[PDB]
Amino acid sequence: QKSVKIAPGAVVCVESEIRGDVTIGPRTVIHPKARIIAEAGPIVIGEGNLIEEQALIINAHPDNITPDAEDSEPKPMIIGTNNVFEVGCYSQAMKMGDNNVIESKAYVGRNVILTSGCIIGACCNLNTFEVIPENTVIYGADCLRRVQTERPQPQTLQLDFLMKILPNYHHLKKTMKG
Amino acid sequence: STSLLSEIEQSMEAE
Amino acid sequence: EKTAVVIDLGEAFTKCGFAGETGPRCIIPSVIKKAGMPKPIKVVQYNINTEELYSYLKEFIHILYFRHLLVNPRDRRVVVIESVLCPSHFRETLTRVLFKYFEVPSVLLAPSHLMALLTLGINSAMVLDCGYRESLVLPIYEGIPVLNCWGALPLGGKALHKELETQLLEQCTVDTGAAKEQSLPSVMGSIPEGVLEDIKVRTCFVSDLTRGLKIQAAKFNIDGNTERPSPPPNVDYPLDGEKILHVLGSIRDSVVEILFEQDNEEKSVATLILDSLMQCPIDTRKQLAENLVIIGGTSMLPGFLHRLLAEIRYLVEKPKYKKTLGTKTFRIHTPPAKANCVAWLGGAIFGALQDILGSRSVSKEYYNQTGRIPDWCSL
Amino acid sequence: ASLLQSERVLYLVQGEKKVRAPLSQLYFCRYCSELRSLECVSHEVDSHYCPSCLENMPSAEAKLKKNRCANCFDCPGCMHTLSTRATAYYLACGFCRWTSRDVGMADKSVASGGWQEPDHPHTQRMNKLIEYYQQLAQ
Amino acid sequence: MELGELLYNKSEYIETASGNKVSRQSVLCGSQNIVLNGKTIVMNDCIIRGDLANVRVGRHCVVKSRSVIRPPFKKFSKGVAFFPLHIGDHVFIEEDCVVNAAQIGSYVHVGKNCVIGRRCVLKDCCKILDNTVLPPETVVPPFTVFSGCPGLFSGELPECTQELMIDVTKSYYQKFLPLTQV
Ligand SMILES: Nc1ncnc2c1ncn2[C@@H]1O[C@H](COP(=O)(O)OP(=O)(O)OP(=O)(O)O)[C@@H](O)[C@H]1O
Ligand SMILES: [Mg+2]
Ligand SMILES: [Zn+2]
Ligand SMILES: [Zn+2]
Helix, strand or coil, rough: CHHHHCCCCCCEECCCECCCCCCCCCCECCCCCCCEEEEEEEEECCCCCCCCCCCCCCCCCCCCCCCCCCCCCCEEEEEECCCECCCCEEECCCCCCCCECCCCCCCECCCCCCCCCEECCCCCCECCCEECCEEECCCCCCCCCEEEECCCCCCCCHHHHHHHHHHCCEEECCCCCC | CHHHHHHHHHHHHHH | CCCEEEEEEECCECCCCCCCCCCCCCEEEEECCCCCCCCCEECCCCCCCCCHHHHHHHHHHHHHHHCCCCCCCCCCCEEEEECCCCCHHHHHHHHHHHHHHCCCEEEEEEEEHHHHHHHHHHCEEEEEECCCCCCCEEEEEEEEEEEHHHHEEECCCHHHHHHHHHHHHHHCCCCCCCCCCCCCCCCCCCCCCHHHHHHHHCCCCCCCCCHHHHHHHHHCCCCCCCCCCCCCEEEEECCCEEEEECCCCHHHHCCHHHHHHCCCCCCCCCHHHHHHHHHCCCCCCHHHHHEEECHHHHHHCCHHHHHHHHHHHHHHHCCHHHHHCCCCCCEEECCCCCCCCCCHHHHHHCCHHHHHHHHHCCCCCHHHCCCCCCCCCCC | CCCCCHCCCEEEEECCCCEEHHHHCCCCCCCCCCCCCCCCCCCCCCCEEEECCCCCHHHHHHHHCCCCCCCEEEECCCCCEEEEECCEEEEECCCCEEEHHHHHHCEECCCCCCCCCCCCCCCCHHHHHHHHHHHCCC | CEEEEEEEECCHHEECCCEEEEEECCCCECCCCECCCCCCCCCCCCEECCCCCCCEEECEEEECCCCCCCCCCCCCCCCCCEECEEEEECCEEEECCCEEEEECCCCCCCCCEEEEEEEEECCCCCEEEEEEEEEECCECCCCCCCCCCCCCCCCCCCCHHHHHHHHHHHHHCCCCCCCCCC
16 A cells, blocks of 8 residues: 555645655645655655645656666655755655755756755756765756855745645645554 | 636536 | 047957946957857958948947947947957948947047057057967057067967867767766767867966976977876866766866977967067167067966966077077066956057047048048058 | 747838848838838937846946946856845845855945945056046147 | 637636636636636646735736746745735746746746746746746846846847737637537
């Protein structure tokens, strides 16, 4: 069974598509039409990672080779805390650090590792694989233009306000106790 | 003003 | 009287602004973006039909006068800085564009070298302009450009970009990132001019005299055993996002050696000044040797001036120049403006001289009456 | 404009220069019955306004301030309007996270007016030179 | 060049009293809060997020498919809230668009595959070329094209944009007639 059990406090809407044995933290918010597909293995999401609109997170088995590596090859996707997944983001990184925001209409490669404080600019692609250093902003569509940043910045107040306003308009998924 | 929900309800009523 | 505008057109960059200013307000690539064509067209092109050049100059000057200078063209005079021995047809086409279309009051076709001289306050020096298209040496003695002793070589930024492209295409090692993390030489047929320019300005540098000579000798490597100096570390220049061109360390200091390489002809950037000086009048030499002014974008490369002065002093001792220019003290000037816009700064200083600028410049009434622009060719 | 392909239909404009252009890009002088093109017509500057803060600027102020807005700043990494942020204020860009702290400009207590451009080092010698050449020109 | 025909199946659309033609597949959220002024076209897979703040949209505007109208979030000193989104009359939003603009004026045309940053202000008669990102707090003045990544002023629209655009949007509405139920 694709267990959709989520910790208390989640504001995932029934319109937001989630499939596979997912795992989401308590304070995470998920907006309608967010897609979280977990076909290769379970997805672990920490507290505060808000998901917006057309955010397609697929833990898809690599079709570039597909050699049946290690039989099932679970490879659980671990996602940090106090993260932001803006509209149109297309994330596939297996590991994500806390304080991570990816701007709208961004591609994240399967083999990329996202560390703490990193930011992905809008209309950018990260098909190339490597670990992102801390507090690295990637901006521009012509190229990547990696630039070091002095500090990160969370969006907790927006998440709290969303927790206030969302359940009045949309019916959150009435997940039973984990 | 006529909210879009009201227009949708009126369209449903017409059907 | 309203402040006169100043324009300095060049193949690589055009410098624009107002007179009596500490520096140019605008400095942009000399291109115009025509619709439908991805890579824009060079505004200043020699040996083309006059209609196309007229249209290009019209569009570019309109961009200058209504995007960068926020002022009408009719009101204010113009001080156009054009290099000596500029192609004639381009010059009369430019003046025709300025007069017939924009109806400016008057355009002063000042020479770049004399204007560059005006910035320092001196009235005599050997001005070398290392432009994009070619390097050009001209001596000025008491405000009189000595055209008889001119010199020029095609060792500007264009030749340097071509050499950089050739060396990169030879020692190409680019990580495409799509199942090509290993070196994949010459994945792209030709590098665009912008990428070459950025690589040249950012990575490449001019090595010391001794290191440069050792590099030149080790290029032949006739019976040599690792005589080259140890190169700087390689630099991984990103292209197009995913691609990463591993610009080799050797290129970074060997690409610019074409400027200073003799190659069995005794012609280089450094030797150019000595060749011009040896042709000068006997009395003018010393004042021209002690006053050297270097301008142009290529001269702004790091370590260029030190290598140039060292090469000058090195070539002075050679038998060709030992008899005449042997016991001379060369000294470089440091004008207030950056070497990109020293000529523009001279034109700007000349622009605020409102009283003379009316008489020296060519009035539009005179151009309409005659249609012949003054030039140092026979009239 | 581009939704309907205006370039498909090209009207010719009479005059010294024969130019074919879309009808939307042509102007019809009523005193001269022949319609006139954008290349044939003469352009003049009517007013200056800052695109970020849509404040009209008089021409004298434009000359004094060197055709630059008094408040807005353009980010150097990418030509985008820098935004003031408070912790006691500093400029930070929206697209790339270029902050004023990177180049090392101390935080200004006031919101907008604190920030200023450096003075050109060679402005004094420029004034000396221009004065000398002015008297020589005289 | 006139606007070509673009037929739609009548089953998956709702025509309203005011004349809005809103697709069934469009993701309307907080529809009690959304307001359309009439003659509006909302295509399939349009995510109009009215559950956060007042999203009012003017007459004859076109919101092509796979376009999201999400009001922006502003963090003011007194606290936090969501700014209402306002769109003027005769706005042509191309498909695969992302709109976080505080205000879009009238006679505006957003190119296809475009993302507009938070709290952007688009004045009347402005264009955004395709594959363009407007970072937050970007103000587009009237009669200007904002193109590139980031969007930078790179041209001016013709004189008759107020007339051409109101012709184009009206033609688009008049040519968006339902399929023949044969
Ligand atoms: N700041 C800089 N540092 C290093 N190189 C530079 C710099 N600015 C320009 N260049 C290079 O200098 C050359 C352009 O020189 P410059 O701007 O003086 O020429 P130009 O006026 O456009 O041309 P020309 O005088 O031949 O008409 C090009 O190689 C450009 O890459
Ligand atoms: Mg030059
Ligand atoms: Zn401003
Ligand atoms: Zn920036």
